[PDB]
Amino acid sequence: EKTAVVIDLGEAFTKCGFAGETGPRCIIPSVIKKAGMPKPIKVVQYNINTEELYSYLKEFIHILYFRHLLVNPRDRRVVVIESVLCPSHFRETLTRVLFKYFEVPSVLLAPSHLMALLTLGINSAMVLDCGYRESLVLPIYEGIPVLNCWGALPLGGKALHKELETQLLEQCTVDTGQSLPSVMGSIPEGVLEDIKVRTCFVSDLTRGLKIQAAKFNRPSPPPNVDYPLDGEKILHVLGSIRDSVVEILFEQDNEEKSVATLILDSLMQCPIDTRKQLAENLVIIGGTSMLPGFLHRLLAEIRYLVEKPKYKKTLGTKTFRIHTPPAKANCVAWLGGAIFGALQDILGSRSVSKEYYNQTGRIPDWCSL
Amino acid sequence: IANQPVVIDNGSGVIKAGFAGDQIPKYCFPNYVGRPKHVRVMAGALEGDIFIGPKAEEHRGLLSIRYPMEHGIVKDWNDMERIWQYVYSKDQLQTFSEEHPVLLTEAPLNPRKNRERAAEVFFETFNVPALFISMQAVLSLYATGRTTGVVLDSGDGVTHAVPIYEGFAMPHSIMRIDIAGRDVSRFLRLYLRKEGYDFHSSSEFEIVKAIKERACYLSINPQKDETLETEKAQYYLPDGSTIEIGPSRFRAPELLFRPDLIGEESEGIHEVLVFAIQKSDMDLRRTLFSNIVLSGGSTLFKGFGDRLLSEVKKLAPKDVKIRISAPQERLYSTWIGGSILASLDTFKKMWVSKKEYEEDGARSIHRKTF
């Protein structure tokens, strides 16, 4: 029996592979390959031209197949993993590509949070997706997502890159061969990603409080290492910015809207029965979730906001506990879609057939008719 | 002591005020408290951290807005004290709180704690000599000048039908759903994320409210607008950009008629009016269907009356005359009728003096107004 190609997009890195395969075969970024392109334009973009996205998706999915899948898009099923709240135009463009240029047997625009829940095997939890563009919370109860309870914040990987760019541009101590600030008006994203993973890290809760005291009248941890850069443009990172980058990620700014506060907000809109079961089942997926100390500071921030006199009288004493998925947090949703794609029993009837799309054109989405 | 009575028409979205006899409330503004995003450490920015109305609308991208009233229930009493004080301040009335009579409005079935705390404020902080916490449906009947009628108001947080037949309010025929304008804006933002644009702030949410108030039509058949392609009427953002809204402008007001599509359990506006009439007596339904009084700001959608006529024709029995009376002053019918009621001479027995409130307290309020 045929397999199922599980395609997962993303603004930063796309994930793809086969069905049943533990872990995807390749994780290629959302960049392109074209002549005369000094900076490869991302494939996953919104509020832009229609035909341009059609061509971008054609070439990207084409090179994705022919470079990391080694199979013709006609012999096996395709389960396109897309997170919920994705723009309808983007989904329609994906459907047009997969049914007008590749002609796959059946696509399946399955949600991300639901399959992330499928990885653990349990049927109900609270899923915090720390994606690239925005953060996303979607409570799932008995396999059904509580869609009216949602939460988004532009504090994903993009906000971390914006923070690192501005802050490193300020204390730009690029040695000669001593300061040399603003040598270049803008720095790329690859060096910024390397600074995030290899040098930046998540602080502690007490350390975060010390940073809060350091905001206005001291940064207690000072470790730093001079990050190199090609062309002998060696810069020097600071021992406090490696803390401040995560501090803006866990900042509130008198609006009570942090990454950890979003889970409590969605828990507040959830019904009374679902409360303790979502507290007893917490799942943290996403790419930003792979930072050292992120889960510890995250859980500490949750429990620190529990006794807050604004959310305590409705939540109170709860048993918060984070699950450990059998895959990496950056690629959990793909493994859920892989286990779902490896289920050839009802997927032939659950997914959208090719014949129905060619003779109908209507795409199923949570909208009337 | 006696002066001109003030009708402080509260509400979940637009707190309205003005003296009695006035046919237009000269001091209306959205009900919220403005505080800047970054916590102030010094001056040189939005000073005082307290913006309401015009000074609140002075800046949008530099404020964190906190609503004080949600679903007709006051969550932050301090914020409501500051908004009431803003009404008595140098920019809204420039009068004295301990001199003028004050009328007050409240949605039905509200908790007693709200009324008790509200009278504690209006009898301890602002020692008003006359306080009468009236309702929000009876006032619309006074504004329209009609005896019978089914008041279907729709503010920002509460939509409730109270069928009053010739001055007799039937309490067991009251249907009350906690869905209105604020939730319409929330699910409108949810649909806007499907369109492509995103909003993540309270002031940004008020920008979404402006998007809602400009273009949101209710077709009789939303599937017809779904099959066809809308022309995507643009909207010039207050920031300076433009947004092609699309189908979300009509998919969002479907909430008030089909809340089961999103995932919330309620009956809808059409079923609120229908079940409110069905809970009444058998001899009054024929007259209550022909006497429907609209109110509130959420009843200001293009094609609202037509779709409501179609849905009531679906639920009500055949050959029954229906008259959905839609006045022009729906956004101020509660305040206008409150002014008419407060201007009456029999209205003197309705309020409670300061000494009278000090006699018993909570029980004095609940006994004299009910």
Added chain:
Amino acid sequence: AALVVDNGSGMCKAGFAGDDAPRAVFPSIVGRPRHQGVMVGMGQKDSYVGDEAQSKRGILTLKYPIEHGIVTNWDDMEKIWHHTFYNELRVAPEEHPVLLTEAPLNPKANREKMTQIMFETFNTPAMYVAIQAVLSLYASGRTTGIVMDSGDGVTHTVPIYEGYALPHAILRLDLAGRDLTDYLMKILTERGYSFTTTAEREIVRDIKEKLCYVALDFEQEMATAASSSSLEKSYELPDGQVITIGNERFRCPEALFQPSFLGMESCGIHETTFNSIMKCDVDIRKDLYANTVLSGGTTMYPGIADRMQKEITALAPSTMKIKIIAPPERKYSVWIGGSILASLSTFQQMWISKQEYDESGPSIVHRKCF
């Protein structure tokens, strides 16, 4: 080898004949989930019935199929019967005769469609429909007395003297447990705890089943509850939230004795029993005042026999021996009586065979019901 199924408007007490306690005890509820465009995956059912819907109650919408003893949805009731037979008792209904319990003064369509379903859908060989009060009298070990049954959707009184019924002195009142649940829900909303959706109705009825008792002197108890506060007890929701209820405890079952709180314009249960006694013959009223039997789940309130005895004592003459019989097993009196009846040596001629339904049809139930 007979099956005794007690289908009320709330629980569905089912089990085998001859047994003391029934096997199946579950809330007769069906529920469809929140139909959204999103999917679920890895399987789930289409409509949860019984404890399935009771545990997964956080997202599904509770829809009772029986309203005031009237089966309002035959497909949902058919789902509950299929769940009962093939899942709670784990035995097909073709190998056994069944015994159903309907309320008195029940519209004939229910009594006939019930038989049509039990024969055409399940292919049962014999089915009998008995009045719940008669079975309560069987389980009470008496052949003389009046049964004041009170379910969640119906409440009736049936006087039976020396095994003979009085079909004209049978009263019926729709003021039962579900109306009490709605009243408690409204007053809990009045104290500041909004229990809006149907999923919250199970929590408010749990509050009713745990902390609600019948006050002896309602005015004295209400005055002391407004005076003191020791009567105010606490309770925990499924969440970590904790509430406190002061009046609600004793003011919740007060509607049973005072229907004016719900606008029913009727008589309380005590005077309903009194009128049901007065409609009998003057020579057999002593036995009815002595053998007054309470049954059903709505009579499980702590301290209710004292209220019934005091009210009837005030109504009945001074030379009468007012005696209230309230067994601790009155929550299953209908089922126990069904067990006794089904296991009798005489009842075999009282069935309705399959060929009898094949010949006559649905009209044989009225000539064979009672």
